[PDB]
């Protein structure tokens, strides 16, 4: 009878599990950036939905007690469920880290509303060095954190394009051969808002042509200010 | 982050803050501590809540809640609670680069 009873109970345990996997991993694959509380909610579900699969378990092993016998299997079935919850356990890691990457997400866009060239500098140098020590920290958990992780080297590239506006160099004629080419309406310096407006032109996408312009326009300055040497001497 | 004013008030922004962890600040180090420990709260709590949200901060202002935690946890001051719970407590004073070290640490489970 016990055989029989435990079939039964292992492909319905089996199944559990599966679900309690596929649980977690959605929460995973899922990315704030800029999606927020809902993540959040989906993590808190994917713990209570584990606290089940806790009291199956519990039971299951009482059973297995209950039969007693030196089973092998019994001991087996038991270390099955262990290993579930140590993925569980990842997965549960893996949306905090997931968190604190938002939180660091939020604050970019607040300081794209806050703008100014002088703190976007200070802020993107700042913003590139805890991305970088953030991406270091993550390792081990489970598989598809790469695909996520990827995302954190998107940001960061975009915390690089940034810094290049952050130079004064440039002027509104700099800034609109520039723009030409990247066709965005923001001019240099065109609002406190315009950081935001920043973002959607991809950091790796647009940094090469912000820097060819931003050299560009460090170099014009060399010239001009000499230039301002030779006026003011001789005017 | 919960800001508190009781031992009574920091235990029960732990145990309102159950999924995650809600860590109790009593007092700080000194030195003007409401405007310093209102503003570190700030970006605590984007570290906190937002960056990592792993965690809310709940200022206590300024009781003993912290030894009161410490207490029950037979385990400035910091009383972490899981599920309303003391169940990491530290003791100390820390300057704001000490605090940027904490938040890579964070968040624990």
């Known amino acids: ?235 | 982050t919960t800001t508190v004013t009781s031992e009574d008030h920091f235990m029960t922004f732990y145990n309102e803050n159950n999924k995650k962890l809600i860590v109790v600040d009593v007092y700080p180090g000194w030195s003007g501590p409401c405007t310093a420990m209102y503003p570190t709260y700030n970006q605590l709590m984007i570290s906190i809540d937002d960056f990592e949200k792993r965690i809310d901060i709940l200022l206590l202002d300024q009781d003993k809640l912290v030894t009161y935690k410490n207490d029950k946890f037979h385990a400035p001051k910091f009383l972490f609670i899981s599920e309303g719970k003391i169940i990491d407590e530290v003791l100390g004073t820390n300057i704001p680069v000490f605090i940027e070290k904490v938040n890579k640490y964070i968040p624990l489970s």
Request: aromatic share 12%; proline share 2%.
């Open chain 1, 1 to 235: 009878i016990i055989p029989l009873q435990a079939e039964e109970t292992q492909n319905i345990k089996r199944d559990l599990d599966i679900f309690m996997k596929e649980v977690e991993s959605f929460r995973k694959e899922f990315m704030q950036k800029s999606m927020g509380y809902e993540n959040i909610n989906n993590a808190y579900d994917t713990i209570m939905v584990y606290y089940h699969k806790l009291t199956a378990i519990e039971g299951r092993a009482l059973e297995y007690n209950n039969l007693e016998k030196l089973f092998e299997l019994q001991k087996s079935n038991y270390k099955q469920l262990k290993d579930c919850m140590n993925d569980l356990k990842n997965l549960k890691t893996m949306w905090d880290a997931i968190a604190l990457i938002h939180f660091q997400y939020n604050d970019w866009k607040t300081k794209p509303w806050r703008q100014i060239k002088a703190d976007i500098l200070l802020d993107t140098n700042k913003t590139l060095g805890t991305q970088i020590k953030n991406l270091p920290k993550e390792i081990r958990n489970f598989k598809g954190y790469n695909v996520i992780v990827e995302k954190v080297k998107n940001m960061g590239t975009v915390l690089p394009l940034v810094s290049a506006l952050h130079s004064e160099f440039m002027e509104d004629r700099h800034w609109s051969q520039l723009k030409q080419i990247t066709g965005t309406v923001f001019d240099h310096n065109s609002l406190s808002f315009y950081f935001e407006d920043i973002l959607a032109l991809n950091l790796y996408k647009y940094e090469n042509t912000v820097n060819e312009i931003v050299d560009v326009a460090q170099k014009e300055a060399k010239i001009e200010k000499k230039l301002k040497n030779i006026e003011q001497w001789w005017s």
